[PDB]
């Protein structure tokens, strides 16, 4: 399920993701002079069922309510203490991303930039967004 | 093929917010910006400020001083924009209008909503 | 604030004349310029962007040229859809700027 790859880079443009898909896994990554605790989850892991979307295997180095998403898709999951300041992503086939191009920097590219996961002959492989940033 | 619906009309008074909305038919926002320009009865365009979907970074007219607040809801692929502290010379059709391209709020518009005329007095 | 003037305000034209529409900015907006058509009671419409290219679905008869501070929106052999108000927007620098509008109407 996961891609091996990482989305496009797009030189100038940055993606993100309306919202995460069942199976994206997330590092348990720490900040400089903190580690990972002992025994503890490697990744965090979006997960669901027919009422609600949530992260499985929390990571450990603020707000006691940790919301669920609808089915489907989990949303951003908070910070955690001591965190690393990258967060290190995994998706899976169907993730979309959506590029914008980073200010100062404009596409002649018309409409929608975004790039899919699919499974094409046997591979996971991104769709090139056809974006230039000038 | 992607259509922006806006909301009915609405009459208010003086002092009060109105927050008008521009939901996407036919398909979804992507990262293209969403703005507002209204249209006083009798003039010409006036820029209020556009939002970028997904990331969320949202610029303004200073001119709107503060008043003009642009959301919008990425799963119902629907924008807002709420004036506040509405006077007489806010009376205008209020348009949303999606960019040609991923090239932030500084776009030309390709897709216009169909307008929401907004009525302030007393 | 970049200003948009546009000239004339309004002009008088029949089916088959070739009307010229200018956009002058106040200072530089290279060609981040645009120009859209709108009908009494609707929405505008988008024709052209970046000063010269023609949006998808948009009759060819339409044409813009002009770079920095001039800019010009032709219709060569106007037809009976082309009746409209007409405003160029600068997509330079913020805030965002329209022209004030140029009304062309049915010459009699």
């Known amino acids: 399920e996961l891609c091996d790859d990482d989305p496009p880079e797009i030189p100038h443009a940055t993606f993100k993701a309306m919202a995460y898909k069942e199976g994206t896994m997330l590092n348990c990554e720490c900040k400089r002079g903190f580690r990972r605790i002992k025994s503890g989850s490697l990744y965090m892991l979006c997960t669901g069922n027919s009422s609600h979307s949530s992260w499985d295997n929390q990571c450990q180095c603020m707000q006691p309510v940790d919301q669920a998403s609808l089915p489907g898709h989990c949303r951003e999951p908070p910070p955690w203490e001591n965190e690393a300041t990258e967060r290190i992503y995994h998706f899976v086939v169907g993730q979309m991303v959506y590029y914008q191009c980073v200010q100062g920097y404009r596409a002649l590219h018309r409409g929608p930039a975004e790039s899919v996961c699919k499974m094409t002959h046997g591979k996971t492989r991104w769709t090139q967004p056809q974006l230039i940033c000038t | 093929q992607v259509q922006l619906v806006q909301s009915g009309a609405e009459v208010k008074k003086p002092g009060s917010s109105v927050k008008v909305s521009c939901k996407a038919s036919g398909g979804t926002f992507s990262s293209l910006a969403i703005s507002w320009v209204r249209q006083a009865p009798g003039q010409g365009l006036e820029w209020m400020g556009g939002?970028?979907?997904?990331?969320?970074?949202?610029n303004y007219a200073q001119k709107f001083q503060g008043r003009v607040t642009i959301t919008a809801d990425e799963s119902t692929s629907t924008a807002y924009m709420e004036l506040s502290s509405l006077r007489s010379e806010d009376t205008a059709v209020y348009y949303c209008?999606?960019?040609?391209?991923?090239?932030?709020?500084?776009?030309?518009?390709?897709?216009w909503g169909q307008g929401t005329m907004v009525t302030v007095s007393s | 604030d970049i200003q948009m003037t546009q000239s004339p305000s309004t002009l008088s034209a029949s089916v088959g004349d070739r009307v010229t529409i200018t956009c002058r900015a106040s200072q530089s907006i290279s060609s981040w310029l645009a120009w859209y058509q709108q009908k009494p009671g609707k929405a505008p419409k988008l024709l052209i962007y970046?000063?010269?290219s023609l949006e998808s679905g948009v009759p060819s008869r339409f044409s813009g040229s002009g770079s920095g501070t001039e800019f010009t929106l032709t219709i060569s052999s106007l037809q009976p859809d082309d009746f409209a108000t007409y405003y160029c927007?600068?997509?330079?620098?913020?805030?965002?700027?329209f022209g004030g509008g140029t009304k062309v109407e049915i010459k009699r």
């Open positions: 970046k000063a010269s």
């Open positions: 939002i970028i979907p997904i990331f969320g970074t949202a």
């Open positions: 927007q600068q997509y330079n620098i913020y805030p965002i700027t």
């Open positions: 209008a999606r960019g040609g391209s991923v090239s932030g709020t500084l776009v030309d518009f390709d897709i």
